[PDB]
């Protein structure tokens, strides 16, 4: 229960850094996107292929499915069905940022040869490196939320 | 009993939801958009005609519409009455969705060929994916809401 | 006085809905405003000829108009006079919206010849059709918030 | 008695006014500016020349002027001293709006031929019948906090 | 002690400017700043040059600094300590006004030559009129709130 | 006693340093950023090499890091293992910024010849000597934090 | 016969003013047509509409049917016959400069609103007075070889 | 024998014609063409599709290969055999104008959807009036040397 | 008799003099002309309004008058009533460079209001001493021959 | 001997044609060159590899050498040794026409990756099935003049 | 007399340098000049006052100076005094040509700060080198023709 | 005496090569340099940098110099003294081909970083390989003429 202490100091470190990370390090995220072509879509059609989902609102998303249980057993004050949530979606939005984008490193270059590009065009993503160590962060924290959930999971079964 | 604690939580939901889509996945909705023209015109009006009320308006509307009735309520303190009106709306909401826009589906190109455009031109939407997703969520709570609100009905 | 409490659901529909409107529908007001014409000016001149006063400005100026008097009653705590005011205000300033504009409908296309433009230049208004129905909601608000108002009055000079 | 609660409506009044007025109607003052020319500086000279004062940070100083007066009181908490100056400001700032701008009404264009410009050149104000309707309201109601406070300090 | 009331009035008419100041009047400072020169680097380098610390920012410092230690004294409860630092700064932020700017008059026109740029270039600043009055304000409620800081400093050494 | 006095001023001071520095001073980081070029991605690359991470987000993670241990506390509620922790951590970023961006000194100009660029180029700082200064005193307060809770140790 | 001698002097003095006209004073012909508009084609089709068929290329085809006779002759050495079509033809090609342009005048401004131009756009005319005049030196010739050819041609035809 | 008069004399007039179409009238024939477009290579293909070979290079290989069969004469001193060639020639180059052009008729505008192109695009014809004017010449004169040579060789 | 001499030499000089002067001097005569604005037709009514004939169709019409009478003659072949001619017409094209142009000196700028302007503008002439010293050697030659045939018609 | 009349019919043959492929076929060769690009050499570049000797320069190369042996021998007035040469020139400028360029058909698009360019580049070629018309001419006419070269040369080793 | 030759030798290798010159070197004049900068006419101006009588025109002027004497000569047949003339004309314009300019040796930089322009800029004059060598030849010839010139003025004064 | 045959003949050769290499592969020589900046001058000085005289105006001096002295002669009608001279210039300018631009091969890059270029940039020569075939042959028959009037030299 000395655990359930530092997942609220955590629960608050990737929001800071979220925020932090969402306004300053990405900004107007697709603005920064720049392509060398002259083409019309070719950017709007390379920034789809590459970014399905943005790490910002994956995190969005993330942390709105890892504070939805937590608002449930609240409501109903079923409490170890809420911490099976909190683990396999917080784990499942880990898996979405292993899968697409490829291993918690920003790409420097992707070469996009969509369709109205008229050939294969050299995109080069902003401010890469920044944008990668609070992807470290972002996900060294959602990592680490786990453990202590899955914790407390089995102190309840266990015990 | 249950039902009525889903119904907030799923409501604050698609509220954050509803934020993250309009200012950053959206962001600039029209600004976005992209067009194959050097006509002045020619992409306001190719906005319009493919996007006359856009899926942030919508849903705007549709969390406004589906607030009144339980709004009612809190002021007369008539409350079955209130959640027919909940259904219907966050229907009716969900109907204008598959007609306009063709199915939940963001197009990744439109061609438009309005007035102003010299001929037919290529337009391209903006992050269709990323707009398709929410669009599933909010339309997936907006078919979960009506659940919960006929069980309700039904249990009345 | 049970509808004394839908003057106050309706007094705010219209308010979110103004502000979806202000914000999201037209936002940057005149920047959407686009005319073929490389005349400097000539966006600014046929701008204000056709919007002497525009709509979110409008709807701003009756909210502050129909809610003044509901203040004036709240610091004599007269009420009879105060109902009269949020009618001829709340109608007024639907008469300026018939007048201008012209009928509750965005244009499509405005045709200005005014000075700076050489000759006359098709100016295009942006995204008319959404504007269009948040008129219609805000008209029809208007227009409701009236037949209560009106009612109210009547209740009291009847009774 | 009923002279103070006008005072406080009006004031609250001609803020929402002046707010509306700021960042919808004059938005981004000079930004909206045009001149008909091709010299750097040459418009930012002619709104220096056109507009020393800018009237929204004319009507910000004059809020700001006429409220101080207002906190002496509360904080000595001399009244009858506060209301000399209310009025006086009130109306100095009435005085720098029919001098400067050349009254009450905003110009449609105005013709600089500053030192940047090669000659006299076009500037066209964006959005005058608009502004020109707003300093009529904030000028009105200025007009008019001058009577209640008049006829306040007559009243004694 | 009717003067500590005029310093707590004084206190908040400085800020109210400020921010009219720092929003309006000067706004997005350096996008505002125009040279005639299509040379990139010359407009940040000359901007660099005349404007070392931005009014805005020397203000929004000074008041930082006259504001610590009407902090430090609340922390305590070395107050006349306090007084003698608000004024020394509050002072200091005034000789930081005339040295740099010279003489709390906005130039209407800098002639930079520094590296990037070719030759001397004509650099424009933009709004210097306003931009004059809110010194003379600024810095006149400096200049008073020393005058009442040393007189509650002496009615404290005299006393 | 009076040292966590002074620990929570310069606290609430270095952050509204650190507000002015980001809003203002900063701004928009890397918009204002110019470089002799017109190769699409040249400059994008040369801001990356040369700020990795730019100021405001290291002392935005400063402010973060230490921050926590203050509230590992608040919650307990070790305090001396805290401390240990908001040493070395405001002094860590403080060691990033001698290396990395080279000693506290805005660089005026920056030389970067990365891949997409055809050779070396021309990047220029805007605004260093206001950024110097804001370094300084965000160092300065950094250095001082470091010992108000080292003599809080030894004090122990 | 003393005015067979003339008709080789003017018929020389509209060559080189022609030459002069074609080069220096119209010179590259549309290039130099200007309107004020973004619109493609709306140039193009503007010129179209007010030069069916420009003057140098007019006073070309002129002085090559007023020459062929004169070759049509030289071969069959129908020498009164001759005369007729250099006549008719050169007079020809004076009502087809009266319809046409409208009285030997240069316009210096034009009003066009062809199909591709959104509405009427103001077409300038480069250099109008200059090629004024040289319409009354081509068109003044013109007009006196026919008096000499219609001379000769009545004085074969009385004698 | 008068046959072989006009032959030489419409001969340099279309020659004559001819010049003045190239050189003015025509001009730079394809710098002229314009498209209402921004793709690179979309105006070289449709200038491509619907002039492949432009009049002037047409009638310059027509009045070329109306100009041999009248110089084997002059080198073998067959003269007969010369002017079956002089009409045929000069009558297919005529078929080639029907045929391509669409018709002695120069089209105001064309719509070209070549690959390049995004869709279909406005393409406009500078001076087809007058061009059309010259072509008539071009091909009257053509259609009366037909005559002249058959006339020639019925008179045989 | 020595008097025809330098006639003939002058008359080449002169020309090779114009020749240098249309081609090189004057080149392109409008393309080079400069104004300071962004008015389409501001440009091409401000040269005709301080050019409306041109230096080098002056001349080019001053050389044609000056050389008619000269060839009546050798078709006749009456002679003193061509030089009659020679002398008003080299005259009169001399009167015409004082009264327009304001005395055989280039204007480095002219200032035009025409109507397609805004206001009043800069234009700047190019190569105005270039241009001032080949009028002086034109209408020096120009003075110079009005001197030989007055002597020779005196000298009958 | 009636065949020496033709060569002298065809070598003009292919000039005049020459003359109007280098003039208004080809026109300003590199100019009408056009890629979908922003970088500078790209185009230069590209143009070099695709055409290292262009067509125009080749066939102006190639009747230059086609020329000198009919001078030579001019000069001696060797018969039979010049006619040698006209052949293997005027065969060896249609190998350099086939490798180069590839079958003697004018491309419409060609795909450039060379250094400059940052990835593979579409460049467009201006009017080619004109060009490929005047190369049909300018081949034909090389590959008959090679023919009647060859039997002059046989006549003279037979006879 | 042997001397009169290399005169007519040197008289036409000026002019075949003076085309070479005049077309390939300085070829479009002014055009290949440039300034950094935005001015409208600053360029213009800045050409004026550093080329008040470009070279090419000089050398044009020159030629066609020391060439109306040796006319003037074949009319008559005085020839004594047309020698005087082709060297004190072909003199005085290598005095022209030291003043203005100055030194045979063209600028690569002149810093122009006429009225246009707002302060001094660079104006870069194109392809210097080059066109030096030209001036060399120009003038050593333009030297050398003075000596025979002199040469046989004495011959004739001394016999 | 067959050694002053192809001396004109080659003579004529190179002559017709020199043609079609300065109007067609040289064509605009500078306009057709293309250099990665957006400094104004950076282009010119580069070019004179690489290129102080053109190749075209060396060879237009070379032909100059090869022909004075062929020209002495005729003008004196000694001989055997001017072949002295068409051989050594003929030579030196095949000098100044190896020394400036490296050996007879056209550079398809070069790299300048003159005065006012901010860094070293990419400066695309245009046609390289072409303007190379052209050098071979203007350098070859150099090569030649050197030969035949070297043999014609130790003939005598
Ligand atoms: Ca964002
Ligand atoms: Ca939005
Ligand atoms: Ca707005
Ligand atoms: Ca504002
Ligand atoms: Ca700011
Ligand atoms: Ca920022
Ligand atoms: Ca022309
Ligand atoms: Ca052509
Ligand atoms: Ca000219
Ligand atoms: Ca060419
Ligand atoms: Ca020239
Ligand atoms: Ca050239």
Chains 1, 3, 5, 7, 10, 11 share one sequence.
């Not at 420097?108 to 609070?134: I, Q, Y």
Request: charged share 15%; with cysteine; aromatic share 16%.
């Amino acid at each position: 229960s000395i655990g359930k202490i530092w997942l609220t100091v955590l629960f608050i470190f990737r929001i800071m850094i979220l925020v932090v990370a969402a306004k300053e390090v990405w900004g107007d995220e697709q603005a920064d996107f720049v392509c060398n072509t002259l083409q019309p879509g070719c950017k709007n059609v390379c920034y789809d292929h590459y970014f399905p989902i943005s790490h910002i609102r994956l995190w969005a998303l993330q942390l709105i499915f890892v504070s939805t249980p937590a608002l449930l057993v609240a409501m109903h004050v079923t409490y170890t069905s809420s911490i099976f949530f909190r683990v396999i979606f917080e784990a499942a939005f880990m898996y979405v940022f292993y899968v697409m984008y490829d291993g918690f490193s920003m790409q420097r270059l992707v070469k996009c040869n969509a369709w109205p590009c008229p050939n294969t065009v050299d995109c080069f993503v902003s401010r890469p490196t920044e944008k990668t160590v609070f992807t470290v962060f972002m996900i060294a924290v959602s990592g680490i939320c786990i453990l202590l959930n899955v914790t407390e999971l089995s102190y309840l079964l266990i015990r």
